[PDB]
Amino acid sequence: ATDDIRAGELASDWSGSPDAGVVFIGRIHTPWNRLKECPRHGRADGPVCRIEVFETWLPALAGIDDGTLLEVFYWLHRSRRDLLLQCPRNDGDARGTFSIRSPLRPNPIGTSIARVDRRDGANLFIRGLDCLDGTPLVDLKPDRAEFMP
Amino acid sequence: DIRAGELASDWSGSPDAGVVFIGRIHTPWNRLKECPRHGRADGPVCRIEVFETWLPALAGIDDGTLLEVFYWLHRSRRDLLLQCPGDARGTFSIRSPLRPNPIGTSIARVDRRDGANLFIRGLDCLDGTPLVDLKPDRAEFMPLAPPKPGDFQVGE
Ligand SMILES: C[S@@+](CC[C@H](N)C(=O)[O-])C[C@H]1O[C@@H](n2cnc3c(N)ncnc32)[C@H](O)[C@@H]1O
Ligand SMILES: C[S@@+](CC[C@H](N)C(=O)[O-])C[C@H]1O[C@@H](n2cnc3c(N)ncnc32)[C@H](O)[C@@H]1O
């Protein structure tokens, strides 16, 4: 059971159904096949990853090209969703889930601010991600600092 | 039903995952045209109501905490690919509330915490918008977990 929690942690017994549905709009390809190999957070000088946007949404890439700084939203598909208190250092220092950027969340939405190296059709070659190879894409937006000074 | 120059997808498939509404955001704006395009730090005070189930997860958030607030734009059509928010633009190239997954964010500082309620300025959503996540904003958060090999990996 990946169900066990660390000392100091707290899991919710909540078992309701979802209120809305998320569509996976692409797939993110990265160097990392194991969670323990992933960066905690991406770095802008990091390895090139490839965001493959699915064919339905290709026209929505209009305006994104080489160099565009993006806020990339992805679904952390391996994460449990029930933790309320977490101890990211496994030392009994428990923090509310909303006070940390842990991938374990009620809605496991991850973001990275990441600049497109190169675009080739549906593929965005991009630096600055931190997710497992094959992580689902859920949204792309222009980063605030570049889009709105 | 769209403007000349826009493009919609005629895609109709089931969702791949489910989103849980963890709260509700209470704001001054009852109509879409009343909402600011983006939130401002000196805008009207709003109330983020976190539902009972997730109250314990607010531990560590208090007056003065800088948050990244994620909400579900529940009134948005999800099919637009080119939009005229002026030449039409790709949906992914703008911060429009009309998106395949209509997730909005605002970066805003908690003015006051009271139990499951956060009183906060800098939002832009319709009164009654569902909350989907809260994170400490990057500008004021330092990751707690220890470094991993990926943290040291620089690209060629
Ligand atoms: C700390 S989270 C930060 C996510 C994002 N940078 C953010 O701030 O929202 C990054 C971690 O999520 C984990 N992870 C990466 N891909 C994942 C996936 N697809 N499902 C669940 N966990 C994942 C890895 O342990 C990685 O180190
Ligand atoms: C331009 S979007 C930006 C959202 C967020 N600040 C971001 O950058 O991700 C803000 C607009 O979304 C619209 N809106 C607000 N709440 C909504 C809701 N619940 N459903 C659909 N549209 C909404 C309003 O027109 C508002 O001006």
Atom 12 of ligand 1: nearest residue by CA position? A103
Q: Is the distance from the beta carbon of residue A27 to the nearest atom of ligand 1 less than 6 Å?
A: no
How far apart, in whole angstroms, are the C-alpha atoms of residue B92 and residue A68? Answer: 11
3-class state of residue B46 by DSSP: strand
Q: Is the distance from the beta carbon of residue B27 to the nearest atom of ligand 2 less than 6 Å?
A: no
How far apart, in whole angstroms, are the C-alpha atoms of residue B12 and residue A24? Answer: 13
Mark B27-49 as b/e (b = at least 16 C-beta within 10 Å): bebeeeeebeeebeeebeebbbe
Output the CA torsion B73→B133→B115→A100 (10° steps): -160
Amino acid at residue number B50: V
Atom 6 of ligand 1: nearest residue by CA position? A41
Locus of tokens 């139990």: B115
How far apart, in whole angstroms, are the C-alpha atoms of residue B132 and residue B134? Answer: 7
Q: What is the 3-state secondary structure (H, E, C) of chain A?
A: CCCCCCCCCEECCCCCCCCEEECCCEEEECCCCCHHHCCCCCCCCCCEEEEEECHHHHHHHCCCCCCCEEEEEEECCCCCCCEEEECCCCCCCCEEHHHCCCCCCCCCEEEEEEEEEEEECCEEEEECCCCCCCEEEEEEEECHHHHCC
Q: What is the nearest CA distance from A5 to chain B, expressed in angstroms? A: 15
Nearest to A53 by CA among A33, A27, A78: A27
Q: Do B92 and A130 touch (CB under 8 A)?
A: no
How far apart, in whole angstroms, are the C-alpha atoms of residue B61 and residue B64? Answer: 8
How far apart, in whole angstroms, are the C-alpha atoms of residue B111 and residue B120? Answer: 5
- Enter the resolution in angstroms: 1.8
Nearest to A133 by CA among A25, A24, A28: A28
How far apart, in whole angstroms, are the C-alpha atoms of residue B80 and residue B65? Answer: 35
> Given 3.40.190.10, 3.40.50.720, 2.40.30.70, 3.30.70.2520, which CATH number is that of A1-149?
2.40.30.70
Segments making up each domain of chain B, as ranges: 1-156
Atom of ligand 2 at shortest range from CA of B36: 27
Which pair of structure tokens corresponds to residue B55? 């109250």
Name the CATH architecture for the domain at B1-156: Beta Barrel (2.40)
Is B146 at the interface with chain A, CB within 8 A?
yes
CA nearest to B146 within chain A: A89
Which pair of structure tokens corresponds to residue B33? 């045209």
Which experiment gave this structure? Answer: X-ray
Residues of B within 8 A of A57 (CB-CB) are 9, 81, 91-92, 100
Q: Is the distance from the beta carbon of residue A110 to the nearest atom of ligand 1 less than 6 Å?
A: yes
Is A77 at the interface with chain B, CB within 8 A?
yes
Q: Is the distance from the beta carbon of residue B76 to the nearest atom of ligand 2 less than 6 Å?
A: yes
3-class state of residue B31 by DSSP: coil
Amino acid at residue number A8: G
Is B136 at the interface with chain A, CB within 8 A?
yes
